[PDB]
Amino acid sequence: ERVNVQELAGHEQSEVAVLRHNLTLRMAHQENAAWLTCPVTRLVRDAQGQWCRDPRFIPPLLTL
Amino acid sequence: LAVQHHRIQRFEKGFLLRGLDVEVTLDGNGFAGEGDIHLFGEMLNRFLALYADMNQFNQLTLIVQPEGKCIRWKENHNPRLPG
């Protein structure tokens, strides 16, 4: 990735190449050749065809 | 009287591309009716007749007398074709 970076003693910015990770959102029942090991949500639908995030989901936690 | 300058530019992919800087001055008044109209319509002409080498990033900086503004002109010039 290439963006603009400046912090130095001075007021000029230039462009340097930085490193960014690659994420995607797969599902639970597909495969495990990628990584997951972490849920983030759980989707249940309404009877009107409306997916909603259920309020009783709990991820594995680092903080409250 | 026109002044010759030159400059060094960084590219997107991290390379230096040589350029120049032309600096012309109007100084003196009554160019034409609307300099906002004419000197815009003038620099679209005088820039296009300024292709002068093969590895020269383009250079037009129009300076009307210190009466509020100086007009720059540059384009996205790339290693395929000048813009």
Side-chain angles (χ1 to χ4, degrees), chain A residues 6-31 33-64:
Chain A
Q6 57 90 21
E7 195 59 37
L8 52 95
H11 298 281
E12 292 182 354
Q13 57 183 354
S14 67
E15 178 181 359
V16 74
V18 302
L19 181 64
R20 291 180 183 271
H21 286 92
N22 190 5
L23 297 179
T24 187
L25 301 184
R26 298 183 70 184
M27 287 182 180
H29 57 273
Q30 297 185 0
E31 282 300 325
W35 180 253
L36 50 143
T37 57
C38 57
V40 290
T41 184
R42 182 180 291 171
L43 293 174
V44 297
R45 84 174 71 252
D46 196 2
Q48 306 298 321
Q50 303 294 323
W51 293 104
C52 65
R53 295 187 285 115
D54 55 349
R56 299 190 307 276
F57 181 76
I58 294 170
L61 295 173
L62 281 179
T63 61
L64 293 173

Side-chain angles (χ1 to χ4, degrees), chain B residues 21-63:
Chain B
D21 279 326
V22 61
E23 292 179 352
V24 293
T25 53
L26 178 63
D27 292 329
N29 52 8
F31 180 79
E34 293 291 326
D36 301 333
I37 281 169
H38 293 92
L39 296 165
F40 178 75
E42 188 70 29
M43 291 300 106
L44 193 64
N45 192 2
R46 295 181 181 181
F47 173 66
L48 198 149
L50 200 62
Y51 289 100
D53 206 1
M54 299 179 70
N55 295 319
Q56 182 268 334
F57 189 82
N58 294 114
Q59 55 165 346
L60 183 60
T61 63
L62 181 67
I63 295 171

Side-chain angles (χ1 to χ4, degrees), chain A residues 2 14-15, chain B residues 12-14:
Chain A
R2 297 187 68 86
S14 67
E15 178 181 359
Chain B
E12 295 179 353
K13 293 183 178 181

